[PDB]
């Protein structure tokens, strides 16, 4: 009378389905999820510096819309723009809005350095009832609305060299009056012009007179432009009317800063990966939460689940 010795392996009563080269579904004893498909719904305030825009877009904070004055000294790793943001100053547009927003977002600061531009023979500090400050009319904090002095608006011609070792961002504009009467009344000349240049490039803008839709009492507009001045280069501004002048420059940096559109609330917690839906854990290699991410994030994929087998084939009794 001998003995029997049987070799075998484990099983569980209910395994997990995985995909292979040959099968779309095969049962194994265990698997682990490789796609992150859920969020807390909240943006964690660490370890990245989160700046909540609240009622302000980055561009309104840059220009210095009065309700955005609280952002003047601000820096961020991630600026969060909310769908409730609104503009409440002189009606404006930005040709290439998306680029200006991108480059400021990427710079990560609104650090503004005032420069002593000399505007000879014009009135400075124009304001509007579309952009109220205190009891009176006002304007964008970083822009200087120049108009005639006496009965003349001379050819303005100023220079500002960059002798620093960083890039300077200058924001300026052009005013588009709604009538010929307003044009000549503000700037004397029947047609204005703004030419802003550095050693190797230039932009010339001719204003356009006509009604746009009424916004905060006005059919006129400002168009916003920008110029980067590199170390060793020089800014020249030349205008015989309609110039919305810079007061200085924004000190540019490079680094890890960006901007995101989201309505998720900010919370006190730690998460490396941020999506517009909220922060997500980054222990998994893939995620299906949002193609928009910031930080150390799983890669976006279309699958909502992908199981990595962590055990053998399940062959129950």
């Amino acid at each position: 009378p001998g003995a029997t010795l049987c070799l075998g392996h484990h099983a569980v009563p209910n395994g997990t389905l995985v995909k292979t080269i040959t099968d779309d579904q095969i049962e194994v004893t265990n698997a682990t999820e490789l796609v992150q498909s859920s969020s807390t719904g909240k943006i964690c305030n660490n370890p990245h510096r989160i700046l909540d825009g609240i009622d302000c877009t980055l561009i309104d904070a840059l220009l210095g819309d009065p309700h955005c004055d609280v952002f003047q000294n601000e820096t961020w790793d991630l600026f969060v723009e909310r769908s409730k943001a609104f503009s409440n100053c002189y009606p404006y547009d930005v040709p290439d809005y998306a680029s200006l927003r991108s480059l400021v977002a990427s710079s990560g600061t609104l650090e503004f350095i005032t420069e002593g531009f000399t505007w000879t023979g014009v009135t400075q500090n124009g304001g509007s009832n579309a952009c109220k400050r205190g009891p009176g009319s006002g304007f964008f904090s970083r822009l200087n609305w120049l108009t005639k002095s006496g009965s003349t608006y001379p050819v303005l011609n100023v220079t500002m060299p960059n002798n620093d070792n960083f890039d300077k961002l200058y924001i300026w504009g052009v005013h588009h009056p709604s009538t010929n009467q307003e044009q000549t009344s503000l700037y004397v000349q029947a047609s204005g012009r703004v030419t802003v240049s550095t050693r190797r490039s230039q932009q010339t803008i001719i204003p356009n007179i006509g009604s746009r839709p009424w916004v905060r009492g006005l059919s006129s507009r400002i168009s916003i432009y920008w110029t980067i001045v590199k170390p060793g280069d020089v800014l020249v501004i030349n205008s015989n009317g309609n110039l919305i002048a810079p007061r200085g420059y924004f000190k540019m940096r490079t680094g890890k800063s960006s901007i995101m559109r989201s309505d998720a609330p900010i919370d006190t917690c730690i998460s490396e990966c941020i999506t517009p839906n909220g922060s997500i854990p980054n222990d998994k290699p893939f995620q299906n939460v949002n193609k928009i991410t910031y930080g150390a994030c799983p890669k976006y994929v279309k699958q909502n689940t992908l199981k990595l087998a962590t055990g053998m084939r399940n062959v129950p009794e």
């Binding site: 070799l7 392996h9 484990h10 995909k19 194994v28 800063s257 893939f286 150390a296 087998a309 009794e317």
Partner: protein
Amino acid sequence: GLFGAIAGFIENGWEGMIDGWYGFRHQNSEGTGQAADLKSTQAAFDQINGKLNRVIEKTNEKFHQIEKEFSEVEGRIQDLEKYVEDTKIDLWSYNAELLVALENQHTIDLTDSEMNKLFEKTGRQLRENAEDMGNGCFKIYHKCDNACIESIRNGTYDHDVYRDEALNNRF
């Protein structure tokens, strides 16, 4: 799997084996029992754990990128931005699908392989003192008390000791 042990010549797994992935069941004069094999279990676990750690090696940190949602129709530049992103997502989705398929095929094959390795190791230990029944079981042709079974399981079974007894019972 490629080796034909798991879901193969071994009919099914043991739900009762909760202390290991592979092991032994025996019947002798003293009754029946079960014991997990640690070495084979460990080899499977180490390989699966190794591949898990390779797959979750954190590799991706991105900051400022391109916009991916747009509130206005713009035409050419926006078409390109969307196409670039859609292209990227499809390629990574493909990579993810292929990765799991290849990993999973391989995990099934390596676990099947470890079953087979344990079976051939046991067979080699037993030399001429046992025969392969074909269902993952060895008919042992001699008296094999619980000490003798443990000797096989912990790798110290001396086949010479029982060879005459076993050879006689077989032939």
